[PDB]
Chain A
Amino acid sequence: SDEKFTTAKIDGFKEFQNFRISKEKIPPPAFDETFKKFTFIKMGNKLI
């Protein structure tokens, strides 16, 4: 860790210049809570 911190200081601590702090407002997600419907074809396919 000391070696890594030395080589990071060498470049002038540029590795901490970029940090990307998020600023969005996170909304509560929406979950589909419904089941699909069934067609008119009682059996599987038209022929049967």
Chain B
Amino acid sequence: SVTSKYLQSTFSKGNTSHIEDKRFIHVSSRSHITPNEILSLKFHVSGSSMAYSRMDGSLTVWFIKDASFDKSVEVYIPDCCGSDKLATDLSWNPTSLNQIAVVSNSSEISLLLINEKSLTASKLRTLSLGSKTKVNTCLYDPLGNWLLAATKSEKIYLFDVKKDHSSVCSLNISDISQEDNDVVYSLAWSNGGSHIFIGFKSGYLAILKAKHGILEVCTKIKAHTGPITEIKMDPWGRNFITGSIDGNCYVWNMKSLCCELIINDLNSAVTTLDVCHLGKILGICTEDEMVYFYDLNSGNLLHSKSLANYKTDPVLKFYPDKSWYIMSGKNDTLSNHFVKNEKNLITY
């Protein structure tokens, strides 16, 4: 019951700060409009940086140095990756401390090294592929050993990041799916780059081996009856969580690959999910503008809330180095959460 009180305190009068971004001051001036979006938001591994990209085209990055974003510098940058094209996915390159990979639904993958002394985001390199190929998702092996780029259909590329991003291998999606017109919806890496978990739209789930740089199909299981939205992994490495649009959220055992626990209070589709860095609490953002916080070990609801028709598409992410979580606010504005006197659950 300690975790329930902790979450309640994290939802209190204080212990909360508004992330002061461009959209925040925009709403402050125009309220005291059509909300663009938040395409994606992804931390650095060491828990001391953050990056995200709205629909306008501008990607913000913060260098966390304070709790309530007091002394946190902010490198705002205009619509990068072209003037017409906007960013859709980014990976933070766990190898170094500054590099970033960004994709813009085009045939060009941009590698930019963000600098913190100035506000200059200088394009370091651009990678290109076949002219028709339209990739939109990039990922980094959590050891910084492989890079993955995926299309909505009929292309999957793996580069070796060590040897100057030499194109290592590729694969046609129709060889992985073997169904009628499947479109990969979400990808994820295993803890320590050894396997790639892919969730198609027709419902299937595939596990590809990427040991020595040669992709191969290990297995395919008919997990869900609708498109798979998100795929997350437990940090301790014992189970991986699958959330779908048919209203189900399962947790699969890693050693044996069989369903072990099911979330049953759900009655709506899932838009995203996330699990804390301690592998203890599981946050589900359903489609009825509502968030839930479940317990991983037992599987019973321990906290609920209600978005109340503010920023229809929400986002949730748990810090990789503290028990804090960034959650969307009212009008596409981010809202930090903490307790200001508890860095981790154990200290509580």
A and B touch in their complex, CB below 8 angstroms: no
* Residues of A near any B CB (own CB < 8 A): none
